[PDB]
Design a protein around this motif. Structure first.
Motif, PDB file in Angstrom:
ATOM      1  N   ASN A 116       0.840  -1.190   0.000  1.00 17.28           N
ATOM      2  CA  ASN A 116       0.000   0.000   0.000  1.00 17.28           C
ATOM      3  C   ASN A 116       0.878   1.244   0.000  1.00 17.28           C
ATOM      4  O   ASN A 116       0.458   2.325   0.422  1.00 17.28           O
ATOM      5  N   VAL A 171      -6.931   5.753  -2.813  1.00 17.67           N
ATOM      6  CA  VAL A 171      -6.579   4.443  -2.281  1.00 17.67           C
ATOM      7  C   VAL A 171      -5.820   4.517  -0.941  1.00 17.67           C
ATOM      8  O   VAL A 171      -6.029   3.692  -0.049  1.00 17.67           O
ATOM      9  N   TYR A 194      -7.144   2.882   2.485  1.00  9.89           N
ATOM     10  CA  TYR A 194      -6.276   1.958   3.208  1.00  9.89           C
ATOM     11  C   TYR A 194      -6.087   2.380   4.666  1.00  9.89           C
ATOM     12  O   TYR A 194      -6.166   1.554   5.569  1.00  9.89           O
ATOM     13  N   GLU A 248      -9.002  -7.692  -8.949  1.00  7.26           N
ATOM     14  CA  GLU A 248      -9.300  -6.603  -9.863  1.00  7.26           C
ATOM     15  C   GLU A 248     -10.390  -6.962 -10.885  1.00  7.26           C
ATOM     16  O   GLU A 248     -10.146  -6.996 -12.096  1.00  7.26           O
ATOM     17  N   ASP A 301      -8.024  -1.990  -5.616  1.00  6.50           N
ATOM     18  CA  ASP A 301      -7.224  -0.796  -5.378  1.00  6.50           C
ATOM     19  C   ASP A 301      -7.953   0.473  -5.827  1.00  6.50           C
ATOM     20  O   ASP A 301      -7.315   1.501  -6.062  1.00  6.50           O
ATOM     21  N   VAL A 310      -6.836  -4.589   0.420  1.00  7.62           N
ATOM     22  CA  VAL A 310      -6.736  -3.293  -0.236  1.00  7.62           C
ATOM     23  C   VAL A 310      -5.247  -3.113  -0.531  1.00  7.62           C
ATOM     24  O   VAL A 310      -4.401  -3.463   0.294  1.00  7.62           O
ATOM     25  N   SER A 311      -4.918  -2.595  -1.706  1.00 10.49           N
ATOM     26  CA  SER A 311      -3.517  -2.376  -2.043  1.00 10.49           C
ATOM     27  C   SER A 311      -3.425  -1.248  -3.051  1.00 10.49           C
ATOM     28  O   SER A 311      -4.408  -0.960  -3.728  1.00 10.49           O
ATOM     29  N   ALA A 312      -2.250  -0.617  -3.148  1.00 10.27           N
ATOM     30  CA  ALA A 312      -2.015   0.496  -4.078  1.00 10.27           C
ATOM     31  C   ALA A 312      -2.227   0.093  -5.541  1.00 10.27           C
ATOM     32  O   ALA A 312      -2.592   0.921  -6.398  1.00 10.27           O
ATOM     33  N   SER A 315      -3.624  -3.664  -7.558  1.00  9.27           N
ATOM     34  CA  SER A 315      -4.183  -4.972  -7.230  1.00  9.27           C
ATOM     35  C   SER A 315      -3.186  -6.126  -7.301  1.00  9.27           C
ATOM     36  O   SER A 315      -3.160  -6.982  -6.408  1.00  9.27           O
ATOM     37  N   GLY A 357      -1.590  -6.582  -4.220  1.00  5.44           N
ATOM     38  CA  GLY A 357      -2.440  -7.150  -3.203  1.00  5.44           C
ATOM     39  C   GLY A 357      -2.300  -8.652  -3.335  1.00  5.44           C
ATOM     40  O   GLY A 357      -2.069  -9.362  -2.355  1.00  5.44           O
TER      41      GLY A 357
END
Ligand SMILES: [Mn+2]
Ligand SMILES: [Mn+2]
Ligand SMILES: [Mn+2]
Ligand SMILES: [Mn+2]
Ligand SMILES: [Mn+2]
Lengths: 269, 258
Positions: free
Chosen positions: A7, A15, A19, A115, A157, A192-194, A196, A199
């Protein structure tokens, strides 16, 4: 630590704010997603593929992440298949991936989305820039899974992807056009990630630590991105056939991966 | 650890632009920068590997940008940095500098004493005195910490107490205009340089060799904060992770600058 790293701040305020809030109440979300992952490896269904208006072609974020998880499931002793669009099936062809045909939630022990578009409040499908998506939907199987109580995991994301329904309040308030584009589809666990793909890699990385094996070993980001790009998948931002993900160039993605592998090795030794 | 991450989470939610704001102040007062570092590890009271590298990284960036820099730190650390030909501060006075930075330096607690994160009292000549004077004088100040007992943490004492063990007793009461919180202090310092690089359009981290800097200062006697041994690591984490952090930051800067 893995959840924090995937993240990393990359100039996308939406995002990052999601997060931050999400992790305030769900500090161990990656750990929980992992626990659900490890407990249901028998037969895993991985869903990925995000249409990019106005072409409605699938992008480079998602499939790489799916392949990584796919890879990890097989290495762990389970079985996996992939549900996605045709242009994506073609892009993943070289990797000898079991494609899903006539899938029903019942047939799986775990279903994961990396995603994938999630229907919005109005039952429609939107992109992060509020443009409507017109392509046959893939979230349908997640609703049936929720109703059957079959383990589900989502990775996103942006806020408009499958699983984001579990934190729609965070999406409506932190992302532009949120109220309209925020997916309503929920999953039992959410990552959740910066980006996908990260992630997905984070899940693989956290699982690696808990099983004592570096399940990321051998992964080559550049080779994978370039393959699916040569194969037709576009970049989400530039909407062109550039070998990159989310408009960010390969050295950044490559760096994330390599750092996760190191973090894993260090944790296992 | 779990503490620092929870404290970072809250701080970042409260101050979304703390790194960006720290960088603005940095870039604005480069004429003569005093960088303070050195954290004694009880019971031996010897300085650890977290801090000196980060300070060195900032020192370099200050000079590449045309400014001048000096270092205030303990004797073993001066020795440890001797190979890098860094200017050492002598009888430093607040007024003489345009900016004063701290990278992992002990800050006095509410009771006036110094404590490690494990609540052991640090017994050695203090280095935070100049930050107290600097703020009273109005001299720009930046602090970088990763525990809550370092100079600059007084700015978020409340966050420290609610997440860090022994909090009330060890939390530093020393404030700083801008504060950077990170998992490892060294990474806070590199983040600052990375952010400055983006603002300037030049990769100021290019050429940074984490392996050399850490093995060098380790050879010189700086111990690992966690194992308290002379291992080439910082914060109990081996070099391949720190190299990875740095490499990742170098690419992010390239992404923004190109
Ligand atoms: Mn997305
Ligand atoms: Mn994306
Ligand atoms: Mn770009
Ligand atoms: Mn510290
Ligand atoms: Mn430290």
């Amino acid at each position: 630590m893995i959840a924090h790293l995937i993240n990393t701040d990359i100039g996308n305020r939406g995002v990052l704010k999601v997060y931050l809030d999400y992790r305030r109440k769900n500090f161990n979300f990656l750990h929980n997603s992992t626990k659900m992952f490890l407990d249901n490896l028998e037969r895993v269904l991985i869903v990925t593929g995000f249409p990019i208006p106005p072409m409605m072609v699938a992008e480079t974020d998602g499939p790489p992440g799916a392949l990584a998880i796919y890879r990890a499931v097989e290495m762990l002793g389970g079985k996996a298949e992939i549900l996605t669009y045709s242009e994506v099936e073609k892009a993943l062809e070289p990797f000898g991936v079991s494609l899903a045909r006539t899938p029903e939630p019942e047939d799986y022990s775990l279903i994961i989305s990396v995603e994938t578009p999630g229907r919005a409040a109005d039952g429609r499908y939107y992109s992060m820039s509020a443009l409507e998506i017109k392509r046959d939907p893939l979230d349908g199987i997640f609703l049936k899974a929720r109703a059957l109580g079959i383990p589900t995991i989502g990775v996103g994301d942006g806020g408009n992807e499958i699983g984001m329904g579990k934190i729609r309040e965070l999406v409506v308030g932190h992302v532009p056009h949120g109220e309209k584009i925020a997916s309503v589809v929920e999953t039992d666990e959410l990552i959740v990630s910066a980006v996908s793909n990260w992630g997905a890699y984070g899940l693989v990385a956290q699982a690696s630590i808990e099983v004592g094996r570096n399940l990321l070993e051998g992964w080559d980001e550049r080779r994978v991105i370039e393959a699916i790009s040569s194969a037709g998948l576009i970049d989400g931002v530039s909407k062109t056939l550039a070998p990159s993900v989310d408009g960010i160039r390969l050295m950044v993605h490559e760096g994330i991966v390599e750092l996760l592998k190191a973090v894993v090795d260090e944790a296992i030794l």
